[PDB]
Design an enzyme around this catalytic site. Structure first.
Site, PDB file in Angstrom:
ATOM      1  N   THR A   1       0.810  -1.219   0.000  1.00 37.71           N
ATOM      2  CA  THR A   1       0.000   0.000   0.000  1.00 37.71           C
ATOM      3  C   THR A   1       0.849   1.278   0.000  1.00 37.71           C
ATOM      4  OG1 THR A   1      -0.051  -0.104   2.388  1.00 37.71           O
ATOM      5  CG2 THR A   1      -1.898  -1.082   1.163  1.00 37.71           C
ATOM      6  N   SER A   2       0.310   2.317  -0.629  1.00 38.89           N
ATOM      7  CA  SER A   2       0.954   3.624  -0.674  1.00 38.89           C
ATOM      8  C   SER A   2       1.227   4.082   0.748  1.00 38.89           C
ATOM      9  CB  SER A   2       0.047   4.639  -1.404  1.00 38.89           C
ATOM     10  OG  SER A   2       0.750   5.830  -1.716  1.00 38.89           O
TER      11      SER A   2
ATOM     12  N   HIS B   1       8.202   0.030   3.401  1.00 37.77           N
ATOM     13  CA  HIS B   1       7.752  -1.223   3.994  1.00 37.77           C
ATOM     14  C   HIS B   1       8.965  -2.114   4.322  1.00 37.77           C
ATOM     15  CE1 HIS B   1       3.558  -0.380   3.338  1.00 37.77           C
ATOM     16  NE2 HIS B   1       3.774  -0.146   2.054  1.00 37.77           N
ATOM     17  N   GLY B   2       8.794  -3.030   5.265  1.00 39.57           N
ATOM     18  CA  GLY B   2       9.902  -3.928   5.607  1.00 39.57           C
ATOM     19  C   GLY B   2       9.432  -5.184   6.307  1.00 39.57           C
TER      20      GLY B   2
ATOM     21  N   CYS C   1       8.433  -1.934   9.105  1.00 39.06           N
ATOM     22  CA  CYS C   1       8.133  -3.087   9.973  1.00 39.06           C
ATOM     23  C   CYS C   1       9.304  -4.063  10.009  1.00 39.06           C
ATOM     24  CB  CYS C   1       6.898  -3.848   9.496  1.00 39.06           C
ATOM     25  SG  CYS C   1       5.384  -2.853   9.683  1.00 39.06           S
TER      26      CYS C   1
END
Lengths: 5, 244
Positions: free
Chosen positions: B29-30, B88-89, B130
């Site tokens: 997601t953006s 993100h991660g 994350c």
């Protein structure tokens, strides 16, 4: 408002 | 020498990788609010006299190429190096717009033996992502050796937004809880406090002042603690004291 990474 | 030398001609680079928009195929997601973080970081590190370079929406290949190229610069006149990753991660992983990059691949370019003009200098990686899918529900309150060497992993500091295995949270309007708090604590305290003590205040701010609000009970009333990982060998201050 709240979103996860 | 209890403190890193920070009176080189330049404080150093601050590379900010700001990944907001992801390939449709990835399902990611953006990341609304990340530009607020990217702008906050830019101003914050500007005021600390870092040469800031912002990069937006890099593929996994572009992240690796950038980091390789930056590691090959001559950093001899720079005191330190800072890299901020906003994406993100998962544990040990940051996302390019088109897929995952191992963090170790990125940080390895800067090892003491691979980036010689940063040997002995603090290398800071600040990671908003994350690290897994756990949720924190919170709780109510003889031999000198001759040739001197240092470890190739020495003088790194990884300022993770969250504990190993856990979600990391972001507000679509205000930015990530961690980057908001980090910038606020640097603005308030970088002219006096040592960096571990600044990051400890960032830990307290994230831990105490934030709690998630979600229409989805699964993600509601959740908490976050950041995670300071230091292989530093000296105290780090973002100022030096003139002699005259």
């Amino acid at each position: 408002x709240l979103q996860p990474x | 020498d209890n403190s890193y030398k920070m009176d080189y001609p330049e404080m150093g680079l601050c590379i900010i990788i700001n990944n907001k928009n992801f390939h449709k195929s990835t399902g990611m997601t953006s990341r609304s609010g990340t530009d607020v973080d990217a702008a906050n970081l830019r101003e914050t590190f500007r005021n600390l006299k870092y040469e800031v370079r912002n990069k937006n929406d890099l593929t996994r290949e572009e992240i690796v190429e950038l980091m390789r190229d930056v590691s090959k610069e001559d950093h001899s006149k720079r005191s330190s190096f800072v890299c901020v990753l906003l994406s993100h991660g998962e544990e040990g992983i940051i996302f390019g717009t088109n897929g995952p990059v191992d963090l170790k691949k990125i940080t390895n370019f800067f090892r003491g033996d691979r980036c010689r003009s940063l040997t002995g200098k603090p290398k800071l990686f600040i990671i908003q992502a994350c690290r897994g899918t756990e949720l924190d529900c919170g709780i109510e309150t003889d031999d000198d050796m001759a040739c001197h060497k240092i470890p190739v992993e020495a003088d790194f500091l990884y300022a993770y937004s969250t504990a190993p295995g856990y979600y990391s949270w972001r507000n679509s309007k205000d930015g990530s809880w961690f980057i908001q708090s980090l910038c606020a604590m640097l603005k308030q305290y970088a002219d006096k406090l040592e960096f571990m003590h600044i990051l400890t205040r960032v830990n307290r701010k994230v831990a105490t002042e934030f709690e998630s609000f979600s229409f989805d009970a699964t993600f509601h009333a959740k908490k976050q603690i950041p995670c300071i990982v230091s292989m530093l060998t000296k105290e780090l201050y973002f100022y030096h004291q003139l002699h005259h």
